[PDB]
Design a protein around this ligand. Structure first.
Ligand SMILES: OC[C@H]1O[C@@H](O[C@H]2[C@H](O)[C@@H](O)[C@H](O)O[C@@H]2CO)[C@H](O)[C@@H](O)[C@@H]1O
Ligand SMILES: OC[C@H]1O[C@@H](O[C@H]2[C@H](O)[C@@H](O)[C@H](O)O[C@@H]2CO)[C@H](O)[C@@H](O)[C@@H]1O
Length: 313
């Protein structure tokens, strides 16, 4: 890999998110240790690990759930054993129990408290990367930027020097990073962020279907991926920042495979600002027909997209 961090999302701990606490192995699962070694064997040195705020912190501003923390720590042991980095992805869409950050129910400070506590747990660990929030939306760019600043500040107050991945609002889409149609863009809002620890990257996501949701197994052209990354890439360069593609995916077809090669090549060519990427997704709980799975088969066989991902790892 020409990029520092390449790998996959191991999805499953965030499943059935309505269920709180939910029951391990019934409503959600953590990854098998064998998942980590499989992806390591393909050249991937980074795992993004979705998990739920509600499961790790059952009451806002309250203590962390020790069982949930233990599961995260067990995944960290597996990552370290396989010489991987682990992104702790608070996979929450700027909500807690269905209520948006910024409402009276969920003040921005509550997210800062969550991250204070996780930072205290993982500060002494070079393998751990802090993924502040999966796909904030339903909150303005300046309000989200304020929430993000509070969270960065809370992490740094603990002494933690770990890399922080900071998203924008609008589902942190790379394509829409500079859009001012509806008001202030992520680009403008996030210009004012300060990290006293100087170890930040901006997390964007990019899907290649008509509305960039990853709802359909279509890539709208064989070049749309790289095209949609350009504005964000320039913004990184303009601001002397780094970026991380926290989710992206393409379906198993010729146009999509061309688009995938194009976007991976594009990030390599622009590795001055792209720190890395994590494909969506692997994990043991996807159905056989899920168009973006790279979880190896029960037969041990590689999924179609893995042959391309492995080339860039
Ligand atoms: O229906 C299967 C499973 O889906 C889970 O949500 C998935 C969703 O299917 C996928 O489109 C999206 O990209 O990822 C999420 C997981 O983060 C859902 O959590 C489960 O309740 C459901 O059984
Ligand atoms: O990008 C993944 C994310 O997409 C969400 O859909 C958004 C889409 O990103 C955005 O470009 C479009 O304008 O609006 C839709 C929402 O209607 C999707 O809802 C998420 O589940 C998904 O993770």
């Amino acid at each position: 890999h020409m990029l520092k961090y390449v790998g996959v999302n191991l999805s499953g701990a965030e499943f059935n998110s309505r269920k709180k606490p939910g029951t391990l192995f019934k409503d959600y699962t953590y990854p098998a240790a064998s998942d980590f070694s499989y992806f390591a064997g393909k050249g991937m040195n980074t795992i993004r690990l979705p998990f739920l705020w509600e499961r790790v912190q059952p009451e806002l501003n309250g203590p962390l759930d020790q069982a949930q923390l233990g599961l995260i720590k067990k995944s960290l042991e597996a990552a370290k054993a396989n010489k991987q980095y682990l992104i702790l992805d608070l996979h929450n869409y700027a909500t807690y129990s269905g209520k948006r950050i910024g409402t009276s129910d969920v003040p921005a400070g509550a997210l800062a408290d969550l991250w204070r506590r996780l930072a205290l747990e993982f500060k002494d660990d070079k393998a751990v990367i802090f993924g502040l929030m999966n796909e904030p939306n339903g909150i303005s760019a300046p309000d989200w930027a304020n929430a993000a600043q509070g969270t960065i500040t809370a992490i740094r107050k603990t002494g933690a020097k770990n890399l922080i991945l900071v998203p924008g609002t609008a589902y942190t889409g790379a394509h829409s990073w500079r859009s001012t149609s509806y008001g202030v863009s992520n680009a403008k809002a996030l210009e004012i962020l300060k990290d006293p620890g100087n170890n930040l990257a901006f997390e964007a996501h990019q899907y290649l279907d008509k509305d960039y949701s990853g709802t359909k197994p279509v890539c709208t052209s064989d070049s749309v991926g790289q095209e949609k990354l350009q504005g964000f890439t320039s913004w990184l360069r303009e601001n002397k920042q780094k970026g991380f593609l926290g989710e992206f995916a393409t379906a198993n077809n010729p146009v999509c495979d061309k688009a995938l090669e194009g976007m991976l090549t594009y990030m390599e060519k622009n590795s001055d600002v792209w720190l890395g990427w994590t494909w969506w997704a692997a994990g043991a709980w996807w159905k056989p027909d899920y168009p973006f799975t790279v979880q190896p088969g029960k037969d041990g066989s590689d999924k179609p997209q893995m042959a391309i991902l492995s080339k860039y790892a």
